[PDB]
Each structure stands twice: as structure tokens, then as C-alpha cells.
Structure 1
Amino acid sequence: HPVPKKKTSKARRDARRSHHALTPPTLVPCPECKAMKPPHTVCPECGYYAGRKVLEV
């Protein structure tokens, strides 16, 4: 039904798509190892805030 009436252009389409886009994810050195890490979750390897509580198997 209440259908679009036409295209309007590479422009205005690219206007919309333009304003989408996306941010880089945050990241920090690990205090311990280094690498990236989202700024505070326990990283997969160096692997803690203080006291490991992960890994090894």
C-alpha cells in the first residue's frame, strides 16, 4: 500500500546512509599484559582486574 512515490537520488540516499556510520570501540592497554581491552572487562588472557579468576584448562 501507501507506497513511496519515487527515488530521489544518490544524494539523499547517501545523506541517510551518511548519517548512519559507526564509532570505533573503546580500548586500553591491559594493566597487566597489554593489548587492547574494552576499558574494563576482564580480558581473555592477562585476564583480570586483580586476582585472575579465569582461564587454564
Structure 2
Amino acid sequence: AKHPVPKKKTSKARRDARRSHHALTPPILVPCPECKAMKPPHTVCPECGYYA
């Protein structure tokens, strides 16, 4: 408001372009040795446990 403000509506082009790096990435997962299910590596998870 006070002082600076956009000089022009951003085009739907430039807008979406800015957003080119917004996409997510799937979580890193590995099949836990004990159970069959998936776990995030280096972590314990329910429906399972650990050795000592």
C-alpha cells in the first residue's frame, strides 16, 4: 500500500511460471524388515517395532 505496489496484473502465464517449482515430491519409503508394510527410513513405526 504505502509506497510500493504492482504496476500491472500478473499474466496467467507468468503466474503459473513462477509456480514451476511448487510441486511436491513423494515421501521416501522402504519396506520395513520385520513387517511387510512401508516405513520412512531410519524410523520406527506402529504395527511393528524393533530389536533391543
Give aligned-pair identity as a percent: 98
In structure 2, how many angstroms separate the alpha carbons of the residues matched to 1:31 and 1:5? 58
Q: Tell me, which stretches of 5 or more residues in structure 1 are unaligned?
A: 51-57
TM-score, length basis structure 2: 0.77
Shift of 1:18: 1.8
Please list every run of at least 4 consecutive aligned residues from structure 1 whose deviation after the TM superposition is greater than 4 angstroms: none
Q: For 1:34, which of 23, 33, 36 is the aligned residue?
A: 36
TM-score, length basis structure 1: 0.72
Please say if residues 42 and 49 of structure 1, whose CA atoms lie closer than 8 Å, have aligned partners that are also in contact.
Answer: no
RMSD: 1.6
Please say if residues 37 and 43 of structure 1, whose CA atoms lie closer than 8 Å, have aligned partners that are also in contact.
Answer: yes
- Larger strand fraction of residues: 2
Q: Tell me, which stretches of 5 or more residues in structure 2 are unaligned?
A: none
Give the match for residue 47 of structure 1: 49
Shift of 1:49: 5.3
